[PDB]
Write an enzyme that holds these catalytic residues in place. Structure first.
Site, PDB file in Angstrom:
ATOM      1  N   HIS A 246     -13.002   8.384  19.212  1.00  0.00           N
ATOM      2  CA  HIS A 246     -11.789   8.064  19.780  1.00  0.00           C
ATOM      3  C   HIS A 246     -10.336   8.306  18.717  1.00  0.00           C
ATOM      4  O   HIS A 246     -10.657   8.076  17.379  1.00  0.00           O
ATOM      5  CB  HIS A 246     -11.767   6.446  20.028  1.00  0.00           C
ATOM      6  CG  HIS A 246     -10.394   6.173  21.043  1.00  0.00           C
ATOM      7  ND1 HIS A 246     -10.339   6.407  22.276  1.00  0.00           N
ATOM      8  CD2 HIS A 246      -9.079   5.612  20.669  1.00  0.00           C
ATOM      9  CE1 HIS A 246      -9.183   6.131  22.810  1.00  0.00           C
ATOM     10  NE2 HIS A 246      -8.459   5.449  21.728  1.00  0.00           N
ATOM     11  N   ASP A 263      -2.241   3.756  21.271  1.00  0.00           N
ATOM     12  CA  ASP A 263      -3.645   3.760  21.611  1.00  0.00           C
ATOM     13  C   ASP A 263      -3.600   4.163  23.118  1.00  0.00           C
ATOM     14  O   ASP A 263      -3.683   3.385  23.933  1.00  0.00           O
ATOM     15  CB  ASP A 263      -4.484   2.632  21.376  1.00  0.00           C
ATOM     16  CG  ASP A 263      -5.980   2.690  21.531  1.00  0.00           C
ATOM     17  OD1 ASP A 263      -6.502   3.572  22.518  1.00  0.00           O
ATOM     18  OD2 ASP A 263      -6.815   2.257  20.871  1.00  0.00           O
TER      19      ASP A 263
END
Lengths: 320, 75
Positions: A246, A263
């Protein structure tokens, strides 16, 4: 936070993290806004998509989407769920936009922001023969394994190598000859992009590697200039987590030192410790770093208003 | 011609290449000397990542030019 996030189509963590980085590079964003996009063909214009995404990140009060931009890449929706290297995208994307900016009022922007020059010096050890090579760069690959911090990384980079044995130098009339090779920076760009080589052979180097909030790089120039010392202030930390994985970007957009975390759809406030020290590593660590030259922060991070978005663009975007 | 390839260690290795060579040809010579499988090489010159299909001449790559080898961190 005052800032909007970006939706994850599936694996666009890499893109959202760069799109944010290139968005907060204000001087670039103003430049993308001023690009002649006569509506072109939307699913064909990467600058139009960048203008869409940049416009809504500036105005929306809800997560922004990436659909049209990946469309403009020539991609199908399955390509939106393959994982990707953030720096490979940046190389591909900024090269795209750079050429799309030629012949328009904004030619030269991407190289003026991001492009520096280095010099390679080669001298033979047992014959009198020397050579030079000057090459431009938009990023710097910094070694990691065995280096404790960024300072030791530039030292190694500019260190002197022995071109020996299976790597002797082709000294022309003198044939293959042992030689020394050394690199120096002639110029460093206003926005420095540092790619940490967090990979050995993919094993992924997760070691502790420390970068600072201020970085004096005068030691690595060839000729220092006292009318513009080479101090760079930390702007962005593109953090990768995994081995696939990620991507997240930590940013102090205004250069003031008040950081946030991006994020995908969630934008958080956070502390310096959480964006710098917590990202030294030792699965989660900085992979790419953005430093802005202190002398040029006012211009690069000049504030951007609706007065910087051409009206023809707003009408195109609105009526869509 | 002799070009230069900076490896994942940062060390410069010499590579023996031809203006005719495609980027897949260059990547294989790298595998031959550094062991890196081509499917994982990414080579950076002047901020351009070189494309499988184009040749070294299409990037004005010449004697003593320097390529920077890089892998992927996917996400």
């Amino acid at each position: 936070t005052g800032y909007v996030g970006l939706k994850n189509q599936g694996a666009t963590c890499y893109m959202n993290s760069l799109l944010q980085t290139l968005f907060f590079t204000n001087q670039l964003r103003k430049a993308v806004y001023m690009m002649p996009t006569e509506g072109d063909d939307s699913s064909k214009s990467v600058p139009l998509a960048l203008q869409r995404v940049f416009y809504e990140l500036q105005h929306s009060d809800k997560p922004v989407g990436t659909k049209k931009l990946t469309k403009s890449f020539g991609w199908e929706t399955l390509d939106s769920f393959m994982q990707h290297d953030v720096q490979e995208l940046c190389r591909v994307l900024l090269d795209n936009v750079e050429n799309k900016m030629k012949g328009t009022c904004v030619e030269g922007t991407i190289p003026k922001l991001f492009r520096g020059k280095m010099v390679s010096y080669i001298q033979c050890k047992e014959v009198d023969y020397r050579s030079d090579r000057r090459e431009d760069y938009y990023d710097i690959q910094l070694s990691i394994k065995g280096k404790k911090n960024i300072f030791e990384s530039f030292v190694d980079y500019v260190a002197v190598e022995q071109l020996d044995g299976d790597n002797k130098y082709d000294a022309g009339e003198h044939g293959l000859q042992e030689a020394e090779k050394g690199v120096k920076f002639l110029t460093l760009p206003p926005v420095l992009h540092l790619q940490l080589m967090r990979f050995m052979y993919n094993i992924k180097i997760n070691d502790r590697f420390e970068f600072p909030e201020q970085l004096p790089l005068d030691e690595f120039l060839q000729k220092t200039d006292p009318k513009d010392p080479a101090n760079y202030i930390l702007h962005a930390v593109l953090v990768h987590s995994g081995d696939g994985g990620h991507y997240v970007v930590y940013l102090n957009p205004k250069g003031d030192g008040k950081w946030c975390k991006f994020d995908d759809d969630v934008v958080s406030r956070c502390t310096k410790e959480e964006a710098i020290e917590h990202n030294y590593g030792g699965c989660t660590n900085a992979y790419m770093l953005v430093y802005i030259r202190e002398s040029k922060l006012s211009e690069v991070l000049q504030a951007v208003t609706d007065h910087d978005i051409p009206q023809q663009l707003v009408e195109r975007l609105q009526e869509e | 011609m002799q070009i230069f390839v900076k490896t994942l260690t940062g060390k410069t290795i010499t590579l023996e290449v031809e203006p005719s060579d495609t980027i897949e040809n260059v990547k294989a010579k790298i595998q031959d000397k550094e062991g890196i499988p081509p499917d994982q090489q990414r080579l950076i010159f002047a901020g351009k990542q070189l494309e499988d299909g184009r040749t070294l001449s299409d990037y004005n790559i010449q004697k003593e030019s320097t390529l920077h080898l890089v892998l992927r961190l996917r996400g």
